[PDB]
Design an enzyme around this catalytic site. Structure first.
Site, PDB file in Angstrom:
ATOM      1  N   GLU A  79     -11.258  -8.490  12.706  1.00  0.00           N
ATOM      2  CA  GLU A  79     -10.026  -8.976  13.315  1.00  0.00           C
ATOM      3  C   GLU A  79     -10.282 -10.158  14.236  1.00  0.00           C
ATOM      4  OE1 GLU A  79      -7.058  -7.829  12.413  1.00  0.00           O
ATOM      5  OE2 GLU A  79      -7.936  -6.327  11.087  1.00  0.00           O
TER       6      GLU A  79
ATOM      7  N   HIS B 128       1.922  -1.194  -2.199  1.00  0.00           N
ATOM      8  CA  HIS B 128       2.166  -2.632  -2.264  1.00  0.00           C
ATOM      9  C   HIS B 128       3.250  -2.989  -3.267  1.00  0.00           C
ATOM     10  CE1 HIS B 128      -1.852  -2.335  -0.447  1.00  0.00           C
ATOM     11  NE2 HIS B 128      -1.549  -3.474   0.149  1.00  0.00           N
TER      12      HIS B 128
ATOM     13  N   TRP C 104       1.130   0.532 -19.668  1.00  0.00           N
ATOM     14  CA  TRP C 104       0.286   0.576 -18.472  1.00  0.00           C
ATOM     15  C   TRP C 104      -0.935   1.448 -18.695  1.00  0.00           C
ATOM     16  CZ3 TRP C 104      -0.367   3.631 -13.610  1.00  0.00           C
ATOM     17  CH2 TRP C 104      -0.893   2.845 -12.583  1.00  0.00           C
TER      18      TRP C 104
END
Ligand SMILES: *[C@@H]1O[C@H](CO)[C@@H](O)[C@H](O)[C@H]1NC(C)=O
Ligand SMILES: *[C@@H]1O[C@H](CO)[C@@H](O)[C@H](O)[C@H]1NC(C)=O
Ligand SMILES: *[C@@H]1O[C@H](CO)[C@@H](O)[C@H](O)[C@H]1NC(C)=O
EC number: 3.4.17.23
Lengths: 593, 201
Positions: free
Chosen positions: A356, A486, A458
């Site tokens: 970070e 996501h 898929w």
């Protein structure tokens, strides 16, 4: 003249954009470190005013014609401002899309699968079911958790995704894009100069090119993991078949890093954990971030600001306010750089502090740019420049230099092999999952996959690309991608693939800059100012230049290269070749148990 | 002789309210004894940069009039308060000539000029048709006409209000925190020079 009008327009826009963006970011910080209703509504009005101002200025910015703008920095600023986004639809369709997105978010955050014949034992994903995916070894309990969250999320998210695709396609075709996949691939579009031109339609084949030669390393890793899981699960896994989807250590198989106790090479050799050394020397979070700052000033990047130490939270506050446990690096604007991280004194939080603060150093370096160009070069650069600091911080040279690891520490080959295997389970194993998920989403948004043949496609490609088979057959009433965070919350996923490539490209370029003479995974960029300057040439750019130019500024290449990634994993790849001689490398597409 | 009647530097430097850089405040100083060791001996006054005269010989070389110009800018624009510089502040707010004889003094003022809600009382000029002449002010609030259409007093596209706010907040980075600047300009004329520093016995 139009270009001088655009220059004065950007000069007028930058000051109000910086003020309103600072107000929005400060309100979001005050909500994220102090959760209450008044901070939530203050964040709501601050984000509302900033978004309303941004769309009001973007409607005026669309009046400029780019055919008579010569200077590419003003042209790039106006390109960044003219991205209308979801506002290109009418208010009814935008409200419908926002309703679908909000109900997807609140049905993923409240996803619920409960124990059959035990109706009191109902488990959420975030506190309890991820523990089952991470720790549990029982086949039937994992089959339960996987199939149950697939059922009670896919059955509820299939029609939501059905109109979500159509609304996102309408929004993308309202912005002169072919589909929503091309809208996401427009984040990699580069237009500056000649030879630095990158196209959206190029990106797919580049990804496919980079998947052409990660595939042997992934096949060897997949074969080794399959053999060790066959040792774990005796009759439920086939030697020539694919892996079952619920035995991969995560809910979706995204990261294989929870398979490390099952797939350890050398169990007698311990790991490189130095948490107890931090406990013995009395380290706290302040010393963690001070050591990260010492690393970043030894490499040549500037010191942390006084407002960073004054305003950030680096500890659980424990004074009655609720916080978010996830570490986040904040660039609030006007030289305000903060880190929100509830740092425990562990090795993982030490590496996360390095990560970070790499994000914060990236944010600090492009502060000289104008406001619209204060971003990453693309979406992968920003996380890659934190992952390289996490890479260099975990090396035994860095830990021996700062006294965390003893000076007489012996680095035998076995600890390098199992460290590289843990890194491969984190890093290499997420690449076919990322590529297959983004390829599925691109072909769904393109319409190359027919609407009634989604699921059957898929599970072909997870049999083909990832080499992971479904445990139970799924029909088209399931929506099995949409169980992931996501995709149910409208996030681009190829940034992790490009992050993984750019990370090792940047690491090899910095280690050649620092003149390291050993293997790449042992490399440290500490006490090397020239590697820091080679890095800071790219960090100072922002997105002022095309990302190919920034990539050439670091590595000397204008495209994604996975030769650094294979060079990082070369001892592990040689070891995996050495222990896959008798076994069968690769998988067969038909369902083998 | 024993000295009295010091020049009112306490009124300029220790004022409770400074001015915006577009309407920068000017105070003339004459017929007093100006001691400049007050300013050098205070460590919060970080930037003490003098042009044309040395800071050490301020008390003995002496002048006819002293102009004290007070304003507030941000930290990274203090470098624009110098001869030969360009920027928003130099071109549009406060210009020094190329033969400027005097000193510039700047210090951080977070505890006096930064508000958590935001100090919107400090303004600066971002748009102007032509550059400022040295020691000129512009307090006009006319809408800047950047295009071909007439503004007619209403802001919008290609029509901007020229005075933009220095929205100071205490959590800003050091280059954006408020800095109070006093520019001392010394001039000699045909008049008898009446601003002269102390002597000893
Ligand atoms: C958290 O927010 C409340 C809301 O007003 C405020 O009173 C309190 O001081 C905040 N806590 C901290 C530590 O600032
Ligand atoms: C980098 O410099 C610091 C400065 O004291 C030193 O302590 C450290 O050992 C150096 N690193 C290496 C790897 O020598
Ligand atoms: C301003 O106040 C300080 C406070 O002690 C004082 O020492 C100083 O003489 C005053 N005047 C100036 C011009 O700094």
């Amino acid at each position: 003249l139009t270009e001088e009008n655009a220059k004065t327009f950007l000069n007028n826009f930058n000051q109000e954009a910086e003020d309103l963006s600072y107000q929005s970011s400060l309100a979001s910080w005050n909500y994220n470190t102090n959760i209450t209703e008044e901070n939530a509504q203050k964040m709501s009005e601050a984000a509302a005013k900033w978004s309303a101002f941004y769309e009001e200025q973007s409607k005026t910015a669309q009046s400029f014609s780019l055919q008579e703008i010569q200077t590419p920095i003003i042209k790039r600023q106006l390109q960044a401002l003219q991205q209308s986004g979801s506002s290109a639809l009418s208010a009814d369709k935008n409200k419908q899309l926002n309703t679908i997105l909000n109900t997807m978010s609140t049905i993923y955050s409240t996803g619920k699968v409960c124990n059959p014949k035990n109706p009191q034992e109902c488990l959420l994903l975030e506190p309890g079911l991820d523990e089952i995916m991470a720790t549990s070894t029982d086949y039937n309990s994992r089959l339960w958790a996987w199939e149950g969250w697939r059922a009670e999320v896919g059955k509820q998210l299939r029609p939501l995704y059905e109109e979500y695709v159509v609304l996102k396609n309408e929004m993308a075709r309202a912005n002169n894009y072919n589909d929503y996949g091309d809208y996401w691939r427009g984040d990699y579009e580069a237009e500056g100069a000649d030879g630095y031109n990158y196209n959206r339609n190029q990106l797919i084949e580049d990804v496919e090119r980079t998947f052409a030669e990660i595939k042997p390393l992934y096949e060897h890793l997949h074969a080794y993991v399959r053999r060790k899981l066959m040792d774990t699960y005796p009759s439920y896994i086939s030697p020539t078949g694919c892996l079952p989807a619920h035995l991969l250590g995560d809910m979706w198989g995204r990261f294989w890093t929870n398979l490390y106790p099952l797939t350890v090479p050398f169990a007698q050799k311990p790991n490189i954990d130095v948490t107890d050394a931090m406990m013995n020397q009395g380290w706290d979070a302040e010393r963690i971030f001070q050591e990260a700052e010492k690393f970043f000033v030894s490499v040549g990047l500037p010191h942390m600001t006084q407002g960073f130490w004054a305003n950030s939270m680096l500890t659980e506050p424990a004074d009655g306010r609720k916080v978010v446990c996830h570490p986040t690096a904040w660039d609030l604007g006007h030289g305000d750089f903060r880190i929100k991280m509830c740092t425990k004194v562990t090795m993982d939080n030490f590496l996360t502090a390095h990560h970070e603060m790499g994000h914060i150093q990236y944010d600090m370096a492009y502060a000289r740019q104008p406001f619209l160009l204060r971003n990453g070069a693309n979406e992968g650069f920003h996380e890659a420049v934190g992952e390289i600091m996490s890479l260099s911080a975990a090396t035994p040279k860095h830990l021996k230099s700062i006294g965390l690891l003893p000076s007489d520490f012996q680095e035998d080959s076995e600890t390098e092999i199992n460290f590289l295997l843990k890194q491969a389970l984190t890093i290499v194993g997420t690449l076919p999952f990322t590529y297959m998920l983004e390829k599925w989403r691109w072909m769904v948004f393109r319409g190359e996959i027919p609407k009634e043949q989604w699921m059957k496609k898929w599970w072909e490609m997870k049999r083909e690309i990832v080499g992971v088979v479904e445990p139970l057959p799924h029909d088209e009433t399931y929506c099995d991608p949409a169980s992931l965070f996501h995709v149910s919350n409208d996030y681009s996923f190829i940034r992790y693939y490009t992050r993984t490539i750019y990370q090792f490209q940047f690491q090899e370029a910095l280690c050649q800059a620092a003149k390291y003479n050993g293997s790449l995974h042992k490399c440290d960029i500490s006490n090397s100012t020239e590697a820091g300057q080679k890095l800071l040439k790219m960090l100072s750019l922002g997105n002022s230049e095309p990302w190919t130019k920034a990539l050439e500024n670091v590595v000397g290449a204008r495209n994604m290269d996975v030769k650094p990634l294979l060079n990082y994993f070369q001892p592990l790849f040689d070891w995996l070749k050495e222990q896959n001689r008798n076994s069968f490398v690769g998988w067969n597409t038909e369902w083998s148990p | 002789p024993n000295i009295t009647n010091l020049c009112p530097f306490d009124e300029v430097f220790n004022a409770t309210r400074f001015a915006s850089v577009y309407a920068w405040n000017r105070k003339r100083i004459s017929n007093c004894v100006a001691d400049y060791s007050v300013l050098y001996n205070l460590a919060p006054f970080f930037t003490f940069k003098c042009y044309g005269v040395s800071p050490t010989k301020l008390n003995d070389l002496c002048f006819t009039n002293v102009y004290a110009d007070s304003f507030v800018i941000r930290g990274d624009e203090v470098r624009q308060i110098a001869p030969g510089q360009t920027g928003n502040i130099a071109d549009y707010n406060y210009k020094l000539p190329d033969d400027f004889t005097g000193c510039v003094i700047a210090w951080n003022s977070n505890k006096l000029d930064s508000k958590v809600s935001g100090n919107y009382n400090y303004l600066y000029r971002l748009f102007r048709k032509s550059n400022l002449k040295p020691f000129e002010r512009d307090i006009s609030t006319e809408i800047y006409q950047a295009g071909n259409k007439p503004c007619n007093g209403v802001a919008g596209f290609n029509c901007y209000f020229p005075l933009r706010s220095y929205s100071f907040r205490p959590t800003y980075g050091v280059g954006h925190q408020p800095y109070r600047v006093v520019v001392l300009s010394f001039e000699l004329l045909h008049a008898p020079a009446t601003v002269c520093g102390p002597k000893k016995s």
